[PDB]
Structures are given as C-alpha cells and as structure tokens.
Amino acid sequence: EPFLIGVSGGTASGKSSVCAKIVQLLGQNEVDYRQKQVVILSQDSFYRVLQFNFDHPDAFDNELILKTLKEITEGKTVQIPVYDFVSHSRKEETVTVYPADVVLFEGILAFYSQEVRDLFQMKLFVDTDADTRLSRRVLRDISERDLEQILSQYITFVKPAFEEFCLPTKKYADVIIPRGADNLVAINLIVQHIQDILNGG
Amino acid sequence: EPFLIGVSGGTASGKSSVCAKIVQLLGQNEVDYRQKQVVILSQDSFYRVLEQKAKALKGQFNFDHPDAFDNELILKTLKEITEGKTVQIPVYDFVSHSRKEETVTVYPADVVLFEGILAFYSQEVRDLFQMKLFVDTDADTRLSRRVLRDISERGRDLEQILSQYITFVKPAFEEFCLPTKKYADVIIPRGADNLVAINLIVQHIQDILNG
Amino acid sequence: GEPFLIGVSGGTASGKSSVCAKIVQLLGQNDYRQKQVVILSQDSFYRVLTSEQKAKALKGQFNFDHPDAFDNELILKTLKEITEGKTVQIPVYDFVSHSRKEETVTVYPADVVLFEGILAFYSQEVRDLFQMKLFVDTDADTRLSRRVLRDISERGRDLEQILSQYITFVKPAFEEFCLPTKKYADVIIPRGADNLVAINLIVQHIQDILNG
Amino acid sequence: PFLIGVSGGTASGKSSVCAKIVQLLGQNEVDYRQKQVVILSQDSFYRVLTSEQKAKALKGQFNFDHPDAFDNELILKTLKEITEGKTVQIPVYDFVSHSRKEETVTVYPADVVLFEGILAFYSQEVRDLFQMKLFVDTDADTRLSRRVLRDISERGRDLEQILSQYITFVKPAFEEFCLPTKKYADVIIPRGADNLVAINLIVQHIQDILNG
Numbered sequence: 001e002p003f004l005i006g007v008s009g010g011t012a013s014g015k016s017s018v019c020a021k022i023v024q025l026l027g028q029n030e031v032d033y034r035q036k037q038v039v040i041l042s043q044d045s046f047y048r049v050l051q052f053n054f055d056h057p058d059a060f061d062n063e064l065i066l067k068t069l070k071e072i073t074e075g076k077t078v079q080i081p082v083y084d085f086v087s088h089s090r091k092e093e094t095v096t097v098y099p100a101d102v103v104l105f106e107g108i109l110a111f112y113s114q115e116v117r118d119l120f121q122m123k124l125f126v127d128t129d130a131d132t133r134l135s136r137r138v139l140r141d142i143s144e145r146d147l148e149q150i151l152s153q154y155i156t157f158v159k160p161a162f163e164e165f166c167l168p169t170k171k172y173a174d175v176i177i178p179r180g181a182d183n184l185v186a187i188n189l190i191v192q193h194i195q196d197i198l199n200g201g
Numbered sequence: 202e203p204f205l206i207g208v209s210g211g212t213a214s215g216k217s218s219v220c221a222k223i224v225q226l227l228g229q230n231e232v233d234y235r236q237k238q239v240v241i242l243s244q245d246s247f248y249r250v251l252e253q254k255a256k257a258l259k260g261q262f263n264f265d266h267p268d269a270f271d272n273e274l275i276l277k278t279l280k281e282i283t284e285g286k287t288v289q290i291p292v293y294d295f296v297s298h299s300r301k302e303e304t305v306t307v308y309p310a311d312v313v314l315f316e317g318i319l320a321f322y323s324q325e326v327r328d329l330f331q332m333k334l335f336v337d338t339d340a341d342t343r344l345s346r347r348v349l350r351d352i353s354e355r356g357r358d359l360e361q362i363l364s365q366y367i368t369f370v371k372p373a374f375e376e377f378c379l380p381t382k383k384y385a386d387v388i389i390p391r392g393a394d395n396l397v398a399i400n401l402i403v404q405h406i407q408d409i410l411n412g
Numbered sequence: 413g414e415p416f417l418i419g420v421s422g423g424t425a426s427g428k429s430s431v432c433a434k435i436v437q438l439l440g441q442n443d444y445r446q447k448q449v450v451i452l453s454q455d456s457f458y459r460v461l462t463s464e465q466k467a468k469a470l471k472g473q474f475n476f477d478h479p480d481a482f483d484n485e486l487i488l489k490t491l492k493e494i495t496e497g498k499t500v501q502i503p504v505y506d507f508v509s510h511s512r513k514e515e516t517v518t519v520y521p522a523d524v525v526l527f528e529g530i531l532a533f534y535s536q537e538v539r540d541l542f543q544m545k546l547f548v549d550t551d552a553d554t555r556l557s558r559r560v561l562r563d564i565s566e567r568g569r570d571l572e573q574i575l576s577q578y579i580t581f582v583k584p585a586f587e588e589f590c591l592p593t594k595k596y597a598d599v600i601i602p603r604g605a606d607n608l609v610a611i612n613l614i615v616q617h618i619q620d621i622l623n624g
Numbered sequence: 625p626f627l628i629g630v631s632g633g634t635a636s637g638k639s640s641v642c643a644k645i646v647q648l649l650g651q652n653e654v655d656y657r658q659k660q661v662v663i664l665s666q667d668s669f670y671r672v673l674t675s676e677q678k679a680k681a682l683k684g685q686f687n688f689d690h691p692d693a694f695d696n697e698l699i700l701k702t703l704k705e706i707t708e709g710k711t712v713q714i715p716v717y718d719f720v721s722h723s724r725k726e727e728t729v730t731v732y733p734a735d736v737v738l739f740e741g742i743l744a745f746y747s748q749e750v751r752d753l754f755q756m757k758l759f760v761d762t763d764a765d766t767r768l769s770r771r772v773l774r775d776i777s778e779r780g781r782d783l784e785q786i787l788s789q790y791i792t793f794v795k796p797a798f799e800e801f802c803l804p805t806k807k808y809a810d811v812i813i814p815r816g817a818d819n820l821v822a823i824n825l826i827v828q829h830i831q832d833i834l835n836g
C-alpha cells in the first residue's frame with residue numbers, strides 16, 4: 001500500500017523544488033533507483049502524443065496518469081515516458097520506477113481529475129502569489145525564447161488555464177504551503193511525516 | 202525548551218476546534234492538568250481590563266481590535282513559558298466584561314498551542330512561535346459558523362450578531378488578521394474537519410514529545 | 413437603432429436588483445406601452461421542473477442557482493429578438509407549480525434594456541449581446557448577512573436550513589459559475605445599491621442614450 | 625471644478641486611461657489656457673529627500689511606492705486650491721537628484737480635474753476632495769507583465785534588477801497601502817485603457833458635466 005501524495009499549484013510556485021528538497025532531505029538521492037523508497041512523478045512527463053495551449057487539461061494523457069498511478073498502488077513496476085520541454089517530443093526511452101513506499105505526484109492539474117484526486121491520501125497545494133510566480137517563470141524560461149513571447153504565452157495560455165482549471169482545485173487540498181521551497185518549516189514538516197511513514201510509527 | 206506553535210485564522214475558522222482536537226488525539230485529556238505535555242492558550246483570555254468604555258450595549262466596543270488585547274502581557278506570558286517557568290493565565294467572562302481574580306495555573310509544558318485571531322499581529326510574539334499555522338476558512342463559511350455558534354452558545358439574537366459582525370468583526374479581520382496570513386508556515390484550508398491536516402500536526406508533536 | 417442592452421450580474425444579495433430598480437426610478441420610467449427603459453430578470457426564465465425535480469425542490473435539494481435551472485435557449489432567443497427591435501413575451505414563472513403560467517408579460521421594444529441575473533454573463537452567446545456589462549461586487553460575507561436577514565424577515569425561513577442550503581448550493585454555484593464571469597464585466601460597481609455615485613453615473617449615461 | 629481620483633496598482637492603466645479619456649474629448653486639440661479637462665499625476669508630488677533618505681535612495685533601499693515618499697501636505701493644499709478655482713503651480717520632480725526643479729507647471733482652473741496616483745485614496749483628507757473615485761483593477765501578474773516590458777524599453781536596466789525591486793518594494797507597498805484603499809472607490813474600471821466601454825462611460829459623463 002504505497003502512500004501517494006499529490007502536490008499541486010501554479011507554475012513556478014515551487015512544486016518541483018519542494019518535492020526535490022523532500023526527497024533530498026530523506027536521502028533518496030543517494031540510494032539506487034531500485035531501492036528508492038520515495039519517488040517523484042511529474043505531470044509534464046505525461047504529455048499527450050504530439051499557438052497551442054499546453055496548460056490545458058486536454059494536453060495531458062489523463063488515462064496514462066490514472067493507469068500508472070493505479071498500477072503504482074498495486075505494487076507493480078511502471079515505466080514513465082520522458083518529455084523535453086523545448087522540442088515537445090516524447091522520446092522512446094522510458095524511466096523505470098520500481099515499487100516505492102511514498103510517491104510524490106507534482107502537477108499544475110494534479111487535483112483536476114476526480115479519479116486522480118481520490119488516489120492521494122494527502123493532498124498538498126503550493127500557493128504562491130501570481131506575480132511572484134510570474135517573476136520566477138520569466139527568469140526560468142529565458143535561462144532554460146524571446147522575452148516578449150514568454151509574456152505573450154503566459155498571458156494568453158498559462159494565466160487563463162491556472163484560473164480556470166488549477167485555482168478551483170485548491171479547495172481539494174489538505175495542506176497549503178504558502179511560499180514553496182523557501183518554506184523550510186513546511187518542508188521539514190512533510191519530511192518528518194514521510195520519514196515517520198517509513199518507520200511505521 | 203518548549204515548542205511554541207502559533208495558530209491564527211479568522212473568527213469561527215476552527216482554531217479552537219483544531220487545537221482541542223490536537224490535544225485530544227494526543228490523549229492529554231486523560232493526563233492530569235499538572236502533567237499535561239501539550240497545553241492550549243487562547244487569546245480571548247488576554248483581553249484588556251474592563252473600564253475603557255462602560256457602554257457596550259448602548260454603543261458597542263469593537264473587541265476584535267488589537268488595542269483591546271494585552272499585547273504586553275501576551276509577550277510576557279509567552280516569554281516566561283519559553284524560559285520554562287510556570288505562568289498564571291487570567292480568566293475572563295465575555296458577558297461580564299471583567300477580569301476574574303482567579304487565575305489558571307499552567308505548568309511548563311513541552312508543546313504550547315496559542316490560538317488567536319491576531320496571534321501573528323505583533324512581531325515580538327511572531328518570532329516566539331517556532332511553527333506558525335493559519336486556518337484559512339472562507340469568509341461566508343466563517344460567518345455561517347459564527348452565527349450558529351453565537352445563537353446556541355450565547356443568548357444573542359441574530360440582528361445584533363450580524364450588526365456586530367459587519368461593523369467590527371469583518372473590518373478588523375481584513376485590516377489586522379488577513380495581512381498576517383503571510384507569516385504562516387502551514388495553512389489549514391477548512392479547519393476541524395480537515396482530518397489529514399490535523400493528523401499531520403499530531404504526528405509532528407508526538408515526534409517532538411519522544412525527543 | 414438597436415436597443416442598448418446592459419447586462420448586470422453579481423452574486424445573490426449583492427444589490428443588482430436594487431441597483432437596476434434605483435436606475436429606472438431615478439429615470440422616472442416606472443407606462444409599459446411607452447416606457448423607454450425596462451428591467452429583465454433572469455428569475456423569469458426558470459425552467460419547468462419535471463416530476464422528479466419538483467419532489468427534490470420540496471425536500472430543499474434543488475439548486476436554483478445552477479445554470480441547468482435556467483432556460484438559456486429562451487434567454488438567448490428573447491435577448492436576440494430584443495436587439496432586433498421586436499416585442500417579446502416573457503414568462504411569469506409560477507413557483508408553486510414550478511411551471512410557466514398561461515399569462516405572460518409583454519415587453520415592447522425599449523431604447524435601453526437591463527438584464528439582471530446571477531449567471532447573466534455565463535453563456536457566451538448571451539454575453540456578446542450586451543453592449544455594456546455591469547458586475548455588482550459585494551463581499552461574500554456581506555452578501556450572506558444580507559440574504560440571511562432577507563430570508564428570515566421577508567420570507568420567514570429557518571436559519572439552519574438557510575445556512576445549510578447556502579454552503580451546499582448557493583456558495584458553490586457562485587464560486588463555480590458566477591465569479592468566473594466577473595472578468596467579462598466592463599464596469600464593476602461595488603457595495604451595491606448604496607453606491608449612489610456609480611448609480612448616478614449609469615443613470616446619466618442612459619439619459620444621454622435617450623437624448624442622443 | 626469636478627475632481628476625479630484615479631487609483632490602482634502600477635501598470636494597471638491609470639495613466640493610459642486618463643490619457644485616453646482626455647483624448648476622446650477635444651482636450652488634446654484644445655488650447656492650454658482653455659483646457660477644461662486636465663490630468664494631474666501623483667508622481668509630480670514626490671517629497672524632496674533628506675540627505676539620510678537620499679543616502680538610502682542611492683543604495684537602492686528607498687521604497688518610492690510608500691506613502692512617506694509623497695508630499696501629502698502639498699497634494700492636499702494644491703488640490704484644495706484647485707477646488708477653490710485658483711490657478712495652481714505643480715512641481716517638476718527631478719528623479720536623479722530627488723529634488724524639485726525651479727521650473728513649475730501652471731495649471732489653470734479647469735472644469736474637470738483628473739488626479740491619478742497609486743495612493744490617491746490613501747489620505748482621508750485627499751479622498752474627500754474627489755467627487756468621483758475610480759480604481760483601475762488589473763491582475764497583479766498582468767501588471768507585472770506590463771511593467772517588465774515597459775521598464776526594459778523605457779529605461780536601460782536589466783531584467784533581474786527589475787524583478788528584484790518589484791518583489792522587494794513595489795509588491796509589498798501595493799498590498800499594504802494601495803490595495804486597502806480599493807474599498808473607497810465608487811467605480812472600478814478593469815483591465816485599464818483596453819476597456820473601451822468604461823472609457824466612453826467616463827468620457828460621456830465628463831461631456832455632460834462640461835455642458836451643465
């Protein structure tokens with residue numbers, strides 16, 4: 001019975017950084033990929049087979065997410081597709097994820113599907129202010145196209161999809177983390193809880 | 202070295218019911234009051250002394266303003282708690298609007314929960330809380346909870362409850378309590394019913410109690 | 413020379429019904445055959461309830477604030493013909509039977525038509541017909557206090573049943589369907605009918621539409 | 625004279641709305657002495673900085689979006705003398721030296737005065753001088769997007785310096801001082817100058833004022 005923890009929130013809120021800090025603090029980075037007890041799943045790894053809105057729920061393989069997450073709860077070994085954000089291509093290589101005790105699924109629409117919601121025993125939402133998240137993504141998108149095209153895409157696609165699809169799913173959260181990776185108190189709270197789950201007490 | 206946890210949130214958001222559940226799941230109700238390891242401190246007990254305005258029915262008083270709370274005694278009470286000293290907490294009757302001479306003796310505990318609408322208002326009190334929690338229940342939901350709570354627990358009629366809430370409770374929350382939400386480390390979205398968030402904090406305290 | 417339609421949305425107990433009333437009253441319009449400004453309510457276009465829906469309404473389990481409870485096709489068809497300068501027949505909903513009475517209110521083509529409804533801006537086809545969109549923004553707890561007083565004193569409801577229906581039906585319908593339509597508003601009028609500066613601004617503008 | 629206060633966050637559309645309003649009236653093609661609608665900016669009333677204040681300004685540690693950086697006494701005095709029909713002298717601020725130039729702008733008494741500013745509704749004494757209070761409500765991330773593109777083109781700073789100053793100074797000053805003054809607004813104009821319906825609503829209102 002693996003423990004599934006759903007982490008949602010807008011882009012550049014700190015979902016990936018919070019999950020990375022939790023796994024790093026739990027020492028899972030040093031363990032081999034077979035003996036990993038806490039793994040991280042990114043929703044962007046499940047983009048559907050490909051001016052276009054990639055923040056819309058239709059752009060995500062909802063059935064593959066549900067099947068993979070369900071097979072994880074069944075203790076089965078699953079393979080996750082790889083997706084590069086630059087070329088929008090799903091490479092033929094797959095990441096093999098062996099049965100782990102705790103699974104973190106981060107995604108802007110992780111709480112959108114009701115079938116995916118009920119899979120999570122604990123649901124966390126990284127609530128970061130909209131302008132603050134834009135400041136983080138603007139710096140993130142140039143370092144990792146043109147600055148005018150980044151603001152055009154965010155205003156036309158990212159911002160409307162967050163308010164229409166992500167924001168309504170904030171009410172399904174059990175715990176809200178108010179600033180992201182910098183919130184060391186909240187991270188230490190979840191790190192303490194996942195380590196408490198591994199021990200069994 | 203006691204662990205101070207600050208619990209804030211608007212009125213009727215569930216801070217009292219959450220804290221009461223945290224100590225109940227920890228079995229502190231079965232332990233004697235002198236041997237309690239997790240105690241609860243309510244900000245409503247530290248209301249300032251009352252003769253500032255004798256008339257509270259002819260002209261209401263606005264009890265939700267930070268001026269009506271003894272911020273100096275709150276800082277003194279919490280400071281002596283962090284030092285490991287026994288403290289005496291005053292008793293209050295909301296109807297009598299007076300400070301009873303009898304005090305509740307709270308022995309040094311390992312974990313102390315302080316719940317209050319303005320628990321994160323003063324900076325000197327904020328830094329004492331090692332963990333800051335905020336119960337963020339929607340405004341209309343908190344109003345529906347408070348109306349039903351104030352009619353059964355108190356003998357107030359509905360017209361005075363809504364008039365007192367709109368005139369004083371609502372503006373004081375938005376001016377003083379809402380800006381303090383940013384200081385919170387963990388936000389609990391719905392309150393007492395959120396069993397996943399309560400079990401998370403209960404487990405954290407039980408790990409602190411073991412050492 | 414098409415009629416100037418003005419959409420007025422907002423949550424319940426926000427003041428939109430009183431805002432529209434005070435606008436027509438300040439204009440002195442309230443002569444149904446020669447009136448230049450009329451007020452239309454989304455409440456007139458409730459759908460007729462099936463036998464299973466009527467039974468759910470008696471038990472208090474029917475959401476009257478949900479888009480499914482309104483005849484969007486009738487609203488769109490009525491507002492589309494109003495723009496074309498035609499008389500429209502507007503239903504007179506009988507809530508006792510939850511159906512439309514045989515009698516109907518005849519609205520003659522007016523120069524300015526006000527459509528007031530919680531979900532006035534929900535339908536896109538209905539939304540594009542409005543040349544001006546007003547949203548009465550009043551705080552949720554302030555509107556709740558208004559509705560609780562209006563439901564207990566004017567209607568005589570049970571307090572616990574009001575708050576139970578609000579949390580279960582009224583609140584989710586507002587946050588899911590009404591609030592997302594606030595971004596389509598051209599002008600947002602806060603605090604409701606007491607905002608006399610905003611009302612006199614809309615009253616003055618309609619007078620300029622009639623004089624011009 | 626009709627005083628209209630315009631507030632809202634940075635890059636919301638305040639300056640663009642006021643400029644668009646004045647343009648729709650003949651005021652652009654109206655002589656300077658005969659202008660009936662004039663625009664006043666709160667940026668013209670920055671305080672002269674103390675040597676201690678200027679020291680923090682050189683270090684980049686002075687929040688220019690804070691109420692203390694604005695000359696409230698001079699704003700109140702100038703706006704009061706405008707209401708009395710007096711011709712007033714507004715300063716010309718030199719932001720490099722943080723002082724007032726010897727040259728001043730002469731504002732002849734106009735029938736309608738538009739005062740735009742981030743904290744136009746902060747001082748109660750300045751609020752009560754406005755016959756109409758407008759607030760340009762635009763989403764924070766949208767305004768930040770507008771400010772970034774405006775701060776890179778208008779000035780010669782880099783992107784990382786803009787976002788650092790916005791998160792450190794502009795954002796906390798807006799949420800603490802500018803946002804709580806939104807409740808005093810009589811009308812809320814969303815999205816700024818792109819809101820043509822709201823622009824023509826104020827334009828038609830001012831035109832009706834000029835004709836009595």
Ligand SMILES: [N-]=[N+]=N[C@@H]1[C@H](O)[C@@H](CO)O[C@H]1n1ccc(=O)[nH]c1=O
Pocket residue numbers: 424455476477507
């Ligand atoms: N008649 N009437 N008015 C109302 C009210 O204004 C509207 C709420 O949108 O639905 C109608 N309404 C709602 C609940 C109910 O139990 N009965 C009812 O008639």
